[model samples]
Target: EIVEVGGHIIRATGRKDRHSKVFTSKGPRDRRVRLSAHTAIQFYDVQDRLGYDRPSKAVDWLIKKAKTAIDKL
Candidate 1:
């Protein structure tokens, strides 16, 4: 059991917003979107080797990091 950790951000757009200029207010439409990442990392075969320990530790670390990151933003 391998666990992959990732996240994405969806920016908002409205009539009075800067993003609105990039998008049109026509009929059926999906507005412009963007995704950002501070960085990316990959761990190989962590689950098959470590079993439950790897996932548990990763979840704990991710929760702490996510809270801290969101606070800064």
Candidate 2:
């Protein structure tokens, strides 16, 4: 099994990267700072707990909160 998620070419080395196996896949906007370690886990229910119909809904709240808190510089 093989998957080309984002820009990384990850092949099933022996048996680890096979489908249904928990592994890390890099995102287009990802580097060393951020990553989706459990892609399948997030799709399950973890992301659901964020209370956002759209994935970016939480981002909106996150940024506004940051601007106010960090803007005192």
Candidate 3:
């Protein structure tokens, strides 16, 4: 089987805490992890709040955690 993994960050305008976290609203980030198709699988983006401090930190987690596991599929 063939698999692919990747992730990205985008504006969380639809966040639930938009009203609550006004000033200190640094978060409620929308994380998109992309998994592409090479066979029966379809191109998909997994959404979540991975909860890492920085972009690089989050990338490592996505790669090691999600990517590696996907490879085992």
Candidate 4:
């Protein structure tokens, strides 16, 4: 599957295990972070709220929020 975040297309390669489906991404070239299954779920949740049409915006929002929270510690 593919998602566009911040005008960049995020692509995932899918595979199946004994119990679940796994999704992995090389992420954006500028930010080479590989999303775990848990992170992908969170991204989908944010996308659901913000609208799947703009998943990248949701991701950006989530990152900003997370960074802010992290800085507080």
RMSD of each: 14.5, 10.0, 14.9, 10.2
lDDT of 3 by residue, 1-73 (tens): 1122232233335557433211224743334334446521421122226555555564566577787678878
Q: In candidate 1, which residue pairs clash? A: none
**How does candidate 2 score on lDDT?**
0.50
Best by lDDT: 4
Tell me the number of clashing residue pairs for each predicted model. 0, 0, 0, 1
lDDT of 4 by residue, 5-69 (tens): 53545444534522222233553353335679988888788789877686667777777778957
TM-score of each: 0.23, 0.30, 0.25, 0.39
Worst 10 residues of 1 by lDDT: 1-10
The digit string of per-residue lDDT tens for model 2 on 1-73 reads 4454643443445665343322354423311234366754564353477767865555566676589776786
Instruction: List candidate 1 segments past 4 Å from native.
Output: 1-52
Candidate 3, after superposition: displacement of residue 25 in Å?
40
Regions of candidate 2 where Cα sits further than 4 Å from its true position: 1-34, 38-50
Q: List the candidate numbers ranked by lDDT, top first.
A: 4, 2, 3, 1
Query: Which of candidates 1 and 3 is the stronger one according to TM-score?
Result: 3
Best by TM-score: 4
TM-score of 3: 0.25
> Clash pairs of candidate 2?
none
| Residue 56 in model 3: lDDT | 53
